[PDB]
């Protein structure tokens, strides 16, 4: 392990890949799960051909390039582009052959079956992986949270989860994924920012208003009162600056964007806010252990990086659950990264080091033993 055999932990979450060797506290490779592909032509002799920009360089040439996630909400859409962000991960950040290493991958739960076995296959077959393991996100964020009791809410870039647990025992029927994450809120931010007259009809600036969002857009603790004092703009309005140099001013549009996490009717679905979803998970749980799910609501993921989330949570599940007892929420730092970090310590455990899908284990037995090891 650890630059030896050294299980590669590669968190292939939507929006961002986060990769490092086993035991690493910091995924040295972090870069957006994107593939830049040029739109306009260029007649210049001696110019980077560069048909397929990949990952973080596509952040540099966002104007020309069509930015494209190869994955969508855990579901891998484009497999060779997925292999572009992989092979770039393994040869330009990890800078090593997976042909030696186990590859501890990370994947969203409640996954259609091709996105486990093919996510493993392009590792086993295009790459060589002497071993590997695709892994459920929220549990590994509990590995960096390091606990075994409560309910983990991993809102990465694509999917919010509510994954319960009680002393190592998970409750699968009470696990709920949901599409409320940073990829969604920037579309809501797009439709709600243009009422001020600012249209950004290009993915280049979808990530830039997502950058606005990941800085400015917090969660209203109470919502319509922040909209009530959105009448008199005192501090809610703030100036942002573009890479062009232009200035934005956003007021109420700040807090209401991640209110779609909490009132998805702003998006316009059936979906309740994330607090009713964890509460709905605990509906499905057992009256002895439902107490320990209240006081141990865990937060995780890149969309959960925003201010005002967790206090609205303690307010609202207090409104939902028996307020006779306590509803503490545990929101550690590095919650986007705790998914990866707890994997980077999972591979360190030698009992896990027998829980790998080895090479011939994939080859002769099946791609369905991926499902027998990863559930």
């Amino acid at each position: 392990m650890d630059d030896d055999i050294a299980a590669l932990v590669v968190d292939n979450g939507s929006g961002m890949c986060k990769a490092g060797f086993a035991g690493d506290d910091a995924p040295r490779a972090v870069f957006p799960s994107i593939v830049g592909r040029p739109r306009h032509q260029g007649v210049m002799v001696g110019m980077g051909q560069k048909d397929s920009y990949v990952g973080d360089e596509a952040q540099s040439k966002r104007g020309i390039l069509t930015l494209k996630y190869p994955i969508e909400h855990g579901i891998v859409t484009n497999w060779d582009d997925m292999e572009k962000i992989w092979h770039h991960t393994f040869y330009n950040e990890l800078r090593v052959a997976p042909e030696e290493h186990p590859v501890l991958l990370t994947e969203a739960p409640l996954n259609p079956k091709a996105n486990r076995e093919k996510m493993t296959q392009i590792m086993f077959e295009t790459f060589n992986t002497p071993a590997m393991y695709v892994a459920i996100q929220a549990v590994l964020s509990l590995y960096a949270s390091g606990r075994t009791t409560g309910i983990v809410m991993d809102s990465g870039d694509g999917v919010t989860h509510t994954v319960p647990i009680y002393e190592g025992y998970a409750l699968p029927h009470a696990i709920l994924r949901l599409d409320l994450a940073g990829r969604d809120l920037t579309d809501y931010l797009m439709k709600i920012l243009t009422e001020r007259g600012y249209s950004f009809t290009t993915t280049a600036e979808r990530e830039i208003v997502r950058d606005i969002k990941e800085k400015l857009c917090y969660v209203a603790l109470d919502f319509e009162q922040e909209m009530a004092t959105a009448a008199s703009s005192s501090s809610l309005e703030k100036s942002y600056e573009l890479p062009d140099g232009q200035v934005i001013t956003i007021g109420n549009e700040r807090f209401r964007c991640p209110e779609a996490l909490f009132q998805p009717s702003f998006l316009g679905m059936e979906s309740c806010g994330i607090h009713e979803t964890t509460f709905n998970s605990i509906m499905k749980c057992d009256v002895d252990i439902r107490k320990d799910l209240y006081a141990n609501t865990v937060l995780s993921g890149g969309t959960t990086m925003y201010p005002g989330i967790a206090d609205r949570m303690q307010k609202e599940i207090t409104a939902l659950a028996p307020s006779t007892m306590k509803i503490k929420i545990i929101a550690p730092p590095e919650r986007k990264y705790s998914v990866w970090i707890g994997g980077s310590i999972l591979a360190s455990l030698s009992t896990f080091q027998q829980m790998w899908i080895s090479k011939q284990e994939y080859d002769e037995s099946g791609p369905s033993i991926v499902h027998r090891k990863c559930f």
Partner: protein, 133 residues
């Protein structure tokens, strides 16, 4: 809810572990390349400046493969340098070093993580694939 300033610390340690990688790795390349460019009597104290033109990366690929590669126009200008690395990339895509952000301008700019990201992939296809003679 303090994952943000913790991200200002963590990412500094993300690339601290990557710089502790890439510097020793640059010296892995440095003693590796000065074991080869010493055949053409070129000495490397800095990958990011010596092999920056592309023609010097072309000199390396002429050493490793033991072959000859075209030396197009060079000078002060950007196109001068990009063309030279586009011949290196011609022989490196010939050697299946992809354009996964392993670029012409990446060598010309001397991009610390992709100049070494190119030429370490050259190491990972020299001692794996036939960039050698």
């Amino acid at each position: 809810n303090d994952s943000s300033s913790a991200r200002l610390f963590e990412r500094s340690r993300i690339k601290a572990l990557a710089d502790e990688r890439e510097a020793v790795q640059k010296k892995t390349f440095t003693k590796w390349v000065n074991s080869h460019l010493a055949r053409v009597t070129c000495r490397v104290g800095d990958l990011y400046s010596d092999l920056r033109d592309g023609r010097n990366l072309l000199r390396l690929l002429e050493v490793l493969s033991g072959e000859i590669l075209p030396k197009p126009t060079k000078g002060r200008m950007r196109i001068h340098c990009l063309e030279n690395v586009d011949k290196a990339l011609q022989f490196l895509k010939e050697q299946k070093v992809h354009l996964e952000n392993m670029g012409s301008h990446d060598i010309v700019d001397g991009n610390h993580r992709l100049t070494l990201g190119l030429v370490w992939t050259i190491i990972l296809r020299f001692q794996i694939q036939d960039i050698s003679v």
